[PDB]
Amino acid sequence: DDWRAARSMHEFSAKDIDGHMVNLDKYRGFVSIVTNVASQXGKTEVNYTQLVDLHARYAEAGLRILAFPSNQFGKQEPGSNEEIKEFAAGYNVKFDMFSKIAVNGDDAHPLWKWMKIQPKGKGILGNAIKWNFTKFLIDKNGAVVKRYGPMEEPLVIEKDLPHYF
Ligand SMILES: [Cl-]
Ligand SMILES: [Cl-]
Ligand SMILES: [Cl-]
């Protein structure tokens, strides 16, 4: 379990929503938001629209967003990767969509196993992802800066970006 000894997001890779294997070292030098998404959650609309807004306002300063669909919370992402891709396109998403994953348990994607054990990656109750739309803010070196729970609208994160963004 090599993931445990990693010191950066940039040590990981993940399949994008089209099936292309992305080396997350592409995000070296960028501030990144990593979030678990779902299409059938009461907060789906507010999260997608606000992430799109953040991306529009800060991509040019170096903000990147990595969205990982997951069906682990109320079976609220039951669709295929192709269907999720078209769903996100209906919100005019131009940030990076990934293939559906698990975020908790032994079969969770290793990036998510890693984020949860970082010093600033624990939730208020504990490490497990609790619901759809948990967010992690990741610095230019790939370290976890802060975690935001399901109820935190993406605009909350804006206040924690570098002041010159
Ligand atoms: Cl993967
Ligand atoms: Cl981008
Ligand atoms: Cl929590």
Short mmCIF file of all heavy atoms in Angstrom, two decimals, residues 100-139:
data_model
loop_
_atom_site.label_atom_id
_atom_site.label_comp_id
_atom_site.label_asym_id
_atom_site.label_seq_id
_atom_site.Cartn_x
_atom_site.Cartn_y
_atom_site.Cartn_z
N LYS A 100 -15.92 7.44 -12.37
CA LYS A 100 -16.54 7.19 -11.08
C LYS A 100 -15.63 6.26 -10.24
O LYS A 100 -15.06 5.27 -10.76
CB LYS A 100 -17.93 6.53 -11.30
CG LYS A 100 -18.80 6.41 -10.05
CD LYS A 100 -20.05 5.54 -10.23
CE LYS A 100 -20.78 5.71 -11.49
NZ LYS A 100 -22.03 4.92 -11.46
N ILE A 101 -15.59 6.55 -8.95
CA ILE A 101 -14.77 5.89 -7.96
C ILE A 101 -15.53 5.65 -6.66
O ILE A 101 -16.58 6.27 -6.42
CB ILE A 101 -13.48 6.67 -7.63
CG1 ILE A 101 -13.81 8.05 -7.03
CG2 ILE A 101 -12.60 6.84 -8.85
CD1 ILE A 101 -12.61 8.69 -6.35
N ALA A 102 -14.97 4.79 -5.79
CA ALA A 102 -15.26 4.78 -4.38
C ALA A 102 -14.28 5.71 -3.66
O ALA A 102 -13.11 5.87 -4.07
CB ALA A 102 -15.11 3.35 -3.80
N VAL A 103 -14.76 6.32 -2.57
CA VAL A 103 -13.96 7.25 -1.74
C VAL A 103 -13.73 6.73 -0.32
O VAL A 103 -12.84 7.22 0.35
CB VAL A 103 -14.52 8.70 -1.72
CG1 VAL A 103 -14.58 9.25 -3.14
CG2 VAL A 103 -15.88 8.77 -1.07
N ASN A 104 -14.54 5.75 0.11
CA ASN A 104 -14.37 5.09 1.41
C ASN A 104 -14.21 3.59 1.23
O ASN A 104 -14.60 3.01 0.24
CB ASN A 104 -15.59 5.31 2.33
CG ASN A 104 -15.76 6.75 2.75
OD1 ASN A 104 -14.77 7.48 3.01
ND2 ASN A 104 -17.01 7.17 2.91
N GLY A 105 -13.60 2.96 2.24
CA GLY A 105 -13.37 1.53 2.28
C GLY A 105 -12.08 1.13 1.60
O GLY A 105 -11.35 1.94 1.02
N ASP A 106 -11.85 -0.18 1.58
CA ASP A 106 -10.61 -0.76 1.08
C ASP A 106 -10.44 -0.61 -0.42
O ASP A 106 -9.32 -0.66 -0.91
CB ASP A 106 -10.47 -2.24 1.48
CG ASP A 106 -10.32 -2.47 3.00
OD1 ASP A 106 -10.04 -1.52 3.77
OD2 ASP A 106 -10.47 -3.64 3.44
N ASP A 107 -11.53 -0.41 -1.16
CA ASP A 107 -11.49 -0.28 -2.60
C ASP A 107 -11.55 1.20 -3.06
O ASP A 107 -11.61 1.47 -4.25
CB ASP A 107 -12.61 -1.14 -3.21
CG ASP A 107 -12.51 -2.63 -2.80
OD1 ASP A 107 -11.51 -3.29 -3.21
OD2 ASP A 107 -13.43 -3.16 -2.07
N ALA A 108 -11.45 2.13 -2.11
CA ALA A 108 -11.39 3.55 -2.46
C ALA A 108 -10.16 3.86 -3.34
O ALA A 108 -9.12 3.23 -3.25
CB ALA A 108 -11.33 4.41 -1.22
N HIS A 109 -10.30 4.83 -4.21
CA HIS A 109 -9.18 5.30 -5.00
C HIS A 109 -8.04 5.74 -4.05
O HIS A 109 -8.29 6.41 -3.05
CB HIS A 109 -9.60 6.45 -5.92
CG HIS A 109 -8.56 6.81 -6.92
ND1 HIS A 109 -7.40 7.48 -6.61
CD2 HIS A 109 -8.47 6.51 -8.25
CE1 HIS A 109 -6.64 7.57 -7.69
NE2 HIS A 109 -7.26 6.97 -8.69
N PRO A 110 -6.78 5.33 -4.36
CA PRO A 110 -5.69 5.69 -3.45
C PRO A 110 -5.49 7.18 -3.18
O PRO A 110 -5.05 7.51 -2.10
CB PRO A 110 -4.47 5.02 -4.07
CG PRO A 110 -4.87 4.67 -5.45
CD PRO A 110 -6.34 4.48 -5.47
N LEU A 111 -5.81 8.07 -4.13
CA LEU A 111 -5.71 9.50 -3.82
C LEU A 111 -6.62 9.86 -2.65
O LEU A 111 -6.25 10.66 -1.79
CB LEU A 111 -6.07 10.35 -5.04
CG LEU A 111 -6.23 11.85 -4.78
CD1 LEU A 111 -4.92 12.49 -4.40
CD2 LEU A 111 -6.89 12.52 -5.97
N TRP A 112 -7.84 9.33 -2.65
CA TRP A 112 -8.82 9.60 -1.60
C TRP A 112 -8.41 8.96 -0.26
O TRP A 112 -8.53 9.59 0.79
CB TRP A 112 -10.22 9.18 -2.07
CG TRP A 112 -10.76 10.17 -3.03
CD1 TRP A 112 -10.41 10.35 -4.35
CD2 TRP A 112 -11.65 11.26 -2.70
NE1 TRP A 112 -11.05 11.46 -4.86
CE2 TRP A 112 -11.81 12.04 -3.88
CE3 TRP A 112 -12.29 11.67 -1.53
CZ2 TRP A 112 -12.65 13.16 -3.90
CZ3 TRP A 112 -13.14 12.76 -1.57
CH2 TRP A 112 -13.29 13.51 -2.74
N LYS A 113 -7.86 7.75 -0.29
CA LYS A 113 -7.29 7.14 0.93
C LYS A 113 -6.23 8.07 1.52
O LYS A 113 -6.18 8.29 2.73
CB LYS A 113 -6.73 5.76 0.60
CG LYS A 113 -7.76 4.71 0.19
CD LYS A 113 -7.07 3.33 0.02
CE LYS A 113 -7.98 2.20 -0.26
NZ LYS A 113 -7.17 0.94 -0.35
N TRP A 114 -5.39 8.62 0.64
CA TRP A 114 -4.29 9.49 1.06
C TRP A 114 -4.80 10.84 1.60
O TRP A 114 -4.35 11.31 2.66
CB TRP A 114 -3.33 9.67 -0.12
CG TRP A 114 -2.20 10.61 0.16
CD1 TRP A 114 -0.99 10.34 0.76
CD2 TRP A 114 -2.18 12.02 -0.13
NE1 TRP A 114 -0.25 11.49 0.88
CE2 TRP A 114 -0.95 12.54 0.35
CE3 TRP A 114 -3.08 12.90 -0.74
CZ2 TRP A 114 -0.60 13.89 0.24
CZ3 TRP A 114 -2.73 14.27 -0.84
CH2 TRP A 114 -1.50 14.72 -0.38
N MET A 115 -5.72 11.49 0.89
CA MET A 115 -6.16 12.81 1.33
C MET A 115 -6.72 12.76 2.72
O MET A 115 -6.50 13.68 3.52
CB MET A 115 -7.19 13.40 0.39
CG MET A 115 -6.63 13.84 -0.96
SD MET A 115 -7.81 14.79 -2.00
CE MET A 115 -9.15 13.62 -2.17
N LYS A 116 -7.48 11.70 3.01
CA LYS A 116 -8.20 11.57 4.28
C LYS A 116 -7.30 11.48 5.49
O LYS A 116 -7.76 11.78 6.58
CB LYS A 116 -9.15 10.34 4.25
CG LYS A 116 -10.34 10.53 3.35
CD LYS A 116 -11.31 9.33 3.45
CE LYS A 116 -10.82 8.03 2.83
NZ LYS A 116 -11.76 6.93 3.11
N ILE A 117 -6.05 11.03 5.30
CA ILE A 117 -5.11 10.86 6.44
C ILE A 117 -4.14 12.03 6.58
O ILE A 117 -3.31 12.05 7.47
CB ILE A 117 -4.36 9.49 6.40
CG1 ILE A 117 -3.38 9.37 5.22
CG2 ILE A 117 -5.35 8.32 6.47
CD1 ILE A 117 -2.38 8.24 5.36
N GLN A 118 -4.23 13.02 5.69
CA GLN A 118 -3.36 14.18 5.80
C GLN A 118 -3.71 15.04 7.03
O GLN A 118 -4.88 15.06 7.46
CB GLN A 118 -3.43 15.03 4.53
CG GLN A 118 -2.98 14.31 3.28
CD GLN A 118 -1.67 13.61 3.48
OE1 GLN A 118 -0.65 14.32 3.69
NE2 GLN A 118 -1.66 12.28 3.52
N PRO A 119 -2.73 15.77 7.59
CA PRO A 119 -3.01 16.57 8.78
C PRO A 119 -4.20 17.51 8.69
O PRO A 119 -4.93 17.64 9.64
CB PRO A 119 -1.70 17.33 9.03
CG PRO A 119 -0.65 16.59 8.32
CD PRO A 119 -1.30 15.82 7.21
N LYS A 120 -4.41 18.13 7.53
CA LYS A 120 -5.56 19.03 7.32
C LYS A 120 -6.69 18.36 6.51
O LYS A 120 -7.61 19.05 6.06
CB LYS A 120 -5.06 20.30 6.62
CG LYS A 120 -3.97 21.05 7.37
CD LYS A 120 -4.51 21.67 8.64
CE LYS A 120 -3.50 22.62 9.28
NZ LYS A 120 -3.80 24.02 8.86
N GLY A 121 -6.60 17.04 6.32
CA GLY A 121 -7.65 16.27 5.60
C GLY A 121 -8.69 15.52 6.42
O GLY A 121 -9.51 14.79 5.87
N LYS A 122 -8.67 15.73 7.73
CA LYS A 122 -9.67 15.08 8.58
C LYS A 122 -10.92 15.93 8.68
O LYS A 122 -10.84 17.13 8.84
CB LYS A 122 -9.09 14.88 9.99
CG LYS A 122 -9.93 14.07 10.95
CD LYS A 122 -9.25 13.99 12.32
CE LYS A 122 -9.62 15.19 13.18
NZ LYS A 122 -9.00 15.15 14.53
N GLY A 123 -12.07 15.31 8.72
CA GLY A 123 -13.31 15.98 8.99
C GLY A 123 -13.54 16.22 10.46
O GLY A 123 -12.80 15.73 11.28
N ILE A 124 -14.60 16.95 10.77
CA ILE A 124 -14.91 17.30 12.15
C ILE A 124 -15.22 16.04 12.99
O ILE A 124 -14.77 15.96 14.14
CB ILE A 124 -16.03 18.38 12.24
CG1 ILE A 124 -16.23 18.81 13.70
CG2 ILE A 124 -17.32 17.95 11.55
CD1 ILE A 124 -16.98 20.11 13.81
N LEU A 125 -15.90 15.06 12.43
CA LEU A 125 -16.13 13.78 13.15
C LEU A 125 -14.92 12.86 12.96
O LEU A 125 -14.52 12.18 13.89
CB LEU A 125 -17.39 13.11 12.63
CG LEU A 125 -17.74 11.73 13.23
CD1 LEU A 125 -17.89 11.77 14.74
CD2 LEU A 125 -18.97 11.10 12.57
N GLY A 126 -14.36 12.82 11.76
CA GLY A 126 -13.26 11.92 11.48
C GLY A 126 -12.95 11.88 10.00
O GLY A 126 -13.44 12.71 9.23
N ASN A 127 -12.17 10.87 9.61
CA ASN A 127 -11.58 10.82 8.27
C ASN A 127 -12.59 10.47 7.17
O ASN A 127 -12.51 11.02 6.08
CB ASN A 127 -10.44 9.80 8.21
CG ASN A 127 -9.24 10.19 9.01
OD1 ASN A 127 -9.19 11.26 9.63
ND2 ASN A 127 -8.23 9.33 9.00
N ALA A 128 -13.54 9.57 7.43
CA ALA A 128 -14.40 9.05 6.35
C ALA A 128 -15.11 10.19 5.62
O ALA A 128 -15.56 11.19 6.25
CB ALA A 128 -15.44 8.07 6.89
N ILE A 129 -15.27 10.06 4.31
CA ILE A 129 -16.08 11.02 3.55
C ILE A 129 -17.54 10.79 3.95
O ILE A 129 -18.00 9.64 3.95
CB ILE A 129 -15.89 10.85 2.05
CG1 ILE A 129 -14.38 10.88 1.66
CG2 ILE A 129 -16.70 11.87 1.27
CD1 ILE A 129 -13.61 12.08 2.18
N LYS A 130 -18.27 11.83 4.29
CA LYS A 130 -19.59 11.64 4.89
C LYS A 130 -20.73 11.64 3.89
O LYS A 130 -21.77 11.05 4.16
CB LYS A 130 -19.85 12.69 5.97
CG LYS A 130 -18.84 12.65 7.13
CD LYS A 130 -18.62 11.27 7.71
CE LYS A 130 -17.83 11.21 9.03
NZ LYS A 130 -16.41 11.69 8.82
N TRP A 131 -20.59 12.39 2.80
CA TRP A 131 -21.66 12.52 1.81
C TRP A 131 -21.05 13.08 0.52
O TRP A 131 -19.84 13.37 0.44
CB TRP A 131 -22.83 13.39 2.34
CG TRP A 131 -24.17 13.05 1.68
CD1 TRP A 131 -24.91 13.84 0.83
CD2 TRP A 131 -24.93 11.85 1.88
NE1 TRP A 131 -26.04 13.16 0.47
CE2 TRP A 131 -26.08 11.93 1.07
CE3 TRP A 131 -24.72 10.68 2.61
CZ2 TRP A 131 -27.04 10.90 1.02
CZ3 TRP A 131 -25.66 9.65 2.54
CH2 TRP A 131 -26.80 9.77 1.74
N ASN A 132 -21.89 13.24 -0.49
CA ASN A 132 -21.50 13.90 -1.72
C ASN A 132 -20.98 15.31 -1.48
O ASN A 132 -21.38 15.98 -0.54
CB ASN A 132 -22.72 13.95 -2.67
CG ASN A 132 -23.38 12.59 -2.84
OD1 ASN A 132 -24.58 12.42 -2.47
ND2 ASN A 132 -22.66 11.64 -3.32
N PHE A 133 -20.07 15.76 -2.37
CA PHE A 133 -19.57 17.13 -2.38
C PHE A 133 -18.77 17.49 -1.14
O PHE A 133 -18.87 18.62 -0.63
CB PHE A 133 -20.66 18.12 -2.70
CG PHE A 133 -21.33 17.87 -4.05
CD1 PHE A 133 -22.61 17.35 -4.14
CD2 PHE A 133 -20.63 18.17 -5.23
CE1 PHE A 133 -23.21 17.13 -5.38
CE2 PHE A 133 -21.23 17.98 -6.47
CZ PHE A 133 -22.51 17.43 -6.55
N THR A 134 -17.92 16.56 -0.67
CA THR A 134 -16.79 16.97 0.18
C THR A 134 -15.72 17.60 -0.73
O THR A 134 -15.59 17.18 -1.89
CB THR A 134 -16.30 15.77 0.99
OG1 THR A 134 -17.39 15.28 1.76
CG2 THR A 134 -15.15 16.12 1.91
N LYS A 135 -15.00 18.60 -0.24
CA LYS A 135 -13.95 19.26 -1.05
C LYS A 135 -12.65 19.28 -0.25
O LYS A 135 -12.65 19.49 0.95
CB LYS A 135 -14.32 20.72 -1.39
CG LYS A 135 -15.61 20.91 -2.15
CD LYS A 135 -16.78 21.12 -1.19
CE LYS A 135 -18.03 21.41 -1.95
NZ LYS A 135 -19.27 21.30 -1.16
N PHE A 136 -11.54 19.14 -1.00
CA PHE A 136 -10.21 19.35 -0.48
C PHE A 136 -9.51 20.42 -1.31
O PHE A 136 -9.49 20.35 -2.54
CB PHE A 136 -9.40 18.04 -0.57
CG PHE A 136 -9.88 16.94 0.34
CD1 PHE A 136 -10.92 16.11 -0.05
CD2 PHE A 136 -9.31 16.74 1.60
CE1 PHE A 136 -11.38 15.08 0.76
CE2 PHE A 136 -9.77 15.69 2.43
CZ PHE A 136 -10.81 14.87 2.00
N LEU A 137 -8.93 21.39 -0.61
CA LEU A 137 -8.06 22.40 -1.23
C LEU A 137 -6.63 21.91 -1.14
O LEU A 137 -6.17 21.54 -0.05
CB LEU A 137 -8.20 23.74 -0.55
CG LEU A 137 -7.41 24.94 -1.12
CD1 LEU A 137 -7.85 25.23 -2.53
CD2 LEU A 137 -7.63 26.16 -0.23
N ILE A 138 -5.96 21.89 -2.29
CA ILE A 138 -4.62 21.34 -2.43
C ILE A 138 -3.68 22.44 -2.97
O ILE A 138 -4.03 23.14 -3.92
CB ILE A 138 -4.61 20.16 -3.46
CG1 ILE A 138 -5.73 19.13 -3.24
CG2 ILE A 138 -3.22 19.57 -3.63
CD1 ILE A 138 -5.56 18.35 -2.01
N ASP A 139 -2.51 22.56 -2.34
CA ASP A 139 -1.58 23.63 -2.72
C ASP A 139 -0.74 23.24 -3.94
O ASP A 139 -0.88 22.13 -4.51
CB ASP A 139 -0.78 24.08 -1.49
CG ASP A 139 0.34 23.13 -1.08
OD1 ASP A 139 0.71 22.20 -1.83
OD2 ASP A 139 0.91 23.37 0.04
#
